Write a protein that binds this ligand. Structure first.
Ligand SMILES: O=C1CC[C@@H](C(=O)O)N1
Ligand SMILES: [Cl-]
Length: 304
């Protein structure tokens, strides 16, 4: 029996729900192609690290992969749509925002030699610290782990000192004092056992950024018709299942952080007001960088 074999690099822990859904996707592709396409995922950055996956897929070093594409918004600012703070703070609203951004993002991805087969939101983003934080007076000079330009910008507005670290390297960065604070979901704090190093999480749910499963555009264009439709069928089903799993686990992760000794609370009123002011500035900066396209996306979203 003849079959194509593809390696699919992914950046997050093997037991993170995104990675598990990569395997679900591969199983569906194998079934729906009658065995003709067998995908093996490589989670945890074990084949290509997170910072390498986009280029690997663009050049065909890997045919398919998963990447958190807002970590490439410096090259393509439209990819920052999913880090606009306080714009879409629920799963339902994030789906509407993706619906408003999809055509423009698909066009931008094509210009980068990529096709996104499915995407999936992480849970809402909040702040991890090693101490109580009630205002930006408490955050001045704290070393911070960013995961993209938007989180680095947010950190700088709070007077923190950001450096980018991929999730697979986050535990060691915390253990060695590279950072004492970061923005992420409850999911990544759990997967990286961050209670070993930090004490507080503030549940802001400021945005729901997405992973994307991307395929090399030349490979996609050259696939047999049946293989291509099977990939899309598998992708649609996986994207639905992954987003359901993400939402089902969101609050469970918080309970796990608490069970391991962390203080998990909403941001205080003074702190939240600062975060919302910074978020408005970041949304204005994004709109200036993307221009009319950004105005169109936000308007289309608000009409839904
Ligand atoms: O919730 C999230 C967003 C990206 C990823 C991270 O911290 O790297 N976890
Ligand atoms: Cl569970």
């Amino acid at each position: 029996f003849q079959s194509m074999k593809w390696d699919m690099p992914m950046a997050y822990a093997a037991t993170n729900f995104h990675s598990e859904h990569g395997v679900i996707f591969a199983d569906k592709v194998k079934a729906y192609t009658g065995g003709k396409l067998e995908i093996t995922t490589h989670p945890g950055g074990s084949l290509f690290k997170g910072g390498e996956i986009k280029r690997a897929v663009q050049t065909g070093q890997a045919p398919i992969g998963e990447r958190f594409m807002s970590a490439h918004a410096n090259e393509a600012p439209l990819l920052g749509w999913d880090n606009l703070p306080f714009l879409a703070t629920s799963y339902e609203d994030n789906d509407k925002l993706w619906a408003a951004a999809k055509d423009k993002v698909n066009a931008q991805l094509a210009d980068l030699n990529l096709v996104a087969l499915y995407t999936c939101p992480w849970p809402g983003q909040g702040f991890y610290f090693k101490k109580e934080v009630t205002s930006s007076a408490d955050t001045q000079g704290i070393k911070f782990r960013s995961y993209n330009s938007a989180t680095a910008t947010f950190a700088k507005e709070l007077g923190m000192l950001p450096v980018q670290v991929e999730a697979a390297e986050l535990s060691q960065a915390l253990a060695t004092g590279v950072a004492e604070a970061f923005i992420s979901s409850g999911s990544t704090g759990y997967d990286r056992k961050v209670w070993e190093h930090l004490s507080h999480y503030y549940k802001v749910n400021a945005w729901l950024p997405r992973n994307y499963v991307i395929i090399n555009k030349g490979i996609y264009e050259g696939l047999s018709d049946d293989i291509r439709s099977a990939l899309h069928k598998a992708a649609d089903e996986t994207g639905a299942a992954c987003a359901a799993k993400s939402a089902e686990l969101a609050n469970w992760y918080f309970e796990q952080l608490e069970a391991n000794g962390m203080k998990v609370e909403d941001a205080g009123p003074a702190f939240l007001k600062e975060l919302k002011s910074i978020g408005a500035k970041m949304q204005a900066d994004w709109l200036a960088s993307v221009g009319a396209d950004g105005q169109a996306i936000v308007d289309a979203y608000k009409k839904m």
